[PDB]
Design a protein around this ligand. Structure first.
Ligand SMILES: NC(=O)c1ccc[n+]([C@@H]2O[C@H](COP(=O)([O-])OP(=O)(O)OC[C@H]3O[C@@H](n4cnc5c(N)ncnc54)[C@H](OP(=O)(O)O)[C@@H]3O)[C@@H](O)[C@H]2O)c1
Ligand SMILES: Nc1nc(=O)c2nc(CNc3ccc(C(=O)N[C@@H](CCC(=O)O)C(=O)O)cc3)cnc2[nH]1
Ligand SMILES: [Mn+2]
Ligand SMILES: [Mn+2]
Ligand SMILES: [Mn+2]
Ligand SMILES: [Mn+2]
Ligand SMILES: [Mn+2]
Length: 159
């Protein structure tokens, strides 16, 4: 199955100028926990934003152009990206905006972090139909000395 994982600020903003403005170490820990030992599919802009391979994960990059780094796997279409994951229980799609839009119709599970932060952004998470999705896990956290905004971890499953 295909899952999307993303952190959303107010109004579904996910990025600005190819970066994420905020700093929420609790959410990065949640990201690592839910992606480790799984293949991760990302678009080329997100690859450039991360800047290095994610350890302990098969890194698959979507780009229309030839790859420029043999530490990761480069593919030229959605179908090729899926095939390059092989026969695994769960494929994690880690963005960005244009990649999320393409994989949302295939996905069975969404791992969403709702961050209570107002940030101007130039990239948004896709508008999803709420009726299609069942919330099976939610966990709210107030801000603290390490995490400057409150946040909610949520897992949705396609009904
Ligand atoms: N908050 C979060 O959870 C989160 C997660 C991930 C990313 N982000 C943010 O999202 C932003 C990047 O998102 P973005 O929408 O600009 O870009 P993106 O989705 O990361 O990458 C877009 C690029 O991926 C390639 N691509 C996508 N679909 C393809 C396909 N079907 N076939 C071939 N190539 C394909 C193309 O590369 P080529 O131009 O090389 O063909 C395209 O230009 C950054 O701000 C990043 O920080 C946020
Ligand atoms: N929930 C969520 N939060 C995010 O920040 C996020 N970010 C991306 C894309 N960007 C990034 C940027 C950095 C790292 C990163 O450095 N991850 C380390 C951190 C481990 C830690 O600090 O606890 C990793 O090994 O995964 C991952 C994804 C995709 N999905 C997300 N999903
Ligand atoms: Mn507004
Ligand atoms: Mn297809
Ligand atoms: Mn197969
Ligand atoms: Mn806030
Ligand atoms: Mn749409």
């Amino acid at each position: 199955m295909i899952s999307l994982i993303a952190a959303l600020a107010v109004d579904r903003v996910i990025g600005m100028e190819n970066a994420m403005p905020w700093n929420l170490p609790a959410d990065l820990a949640w990201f690592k926990r839910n992606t480790l030992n799984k293949p991760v599919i990302m678009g080329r802009h997100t690859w450039e934003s991360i800047g290095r391979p994610l350890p302990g994960r098969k890194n698959i990059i979507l780009s229309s152009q030839p790859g420029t780094d043999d530490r990761v796997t480069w593919v030229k279409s959605v179908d090729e990206a899926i095939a390059a994951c092989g026969d695994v229980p769960e494929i994690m799609v880690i963005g960005g905006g244009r990649v999320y839009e393409q994989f949302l119709p295939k996905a069975q599970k969404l791992y969403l972090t709702h961050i209570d932060a107002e940030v101007e952004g130039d990239t948004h998470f896709p508008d999803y139909e709420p009726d299609d999705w069942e919330s099976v896990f939610s966990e709210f956290h107030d801000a603290d000395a390490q995490n400057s905004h409150s946040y909610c971890f949520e897992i949705l499953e396609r009904r």
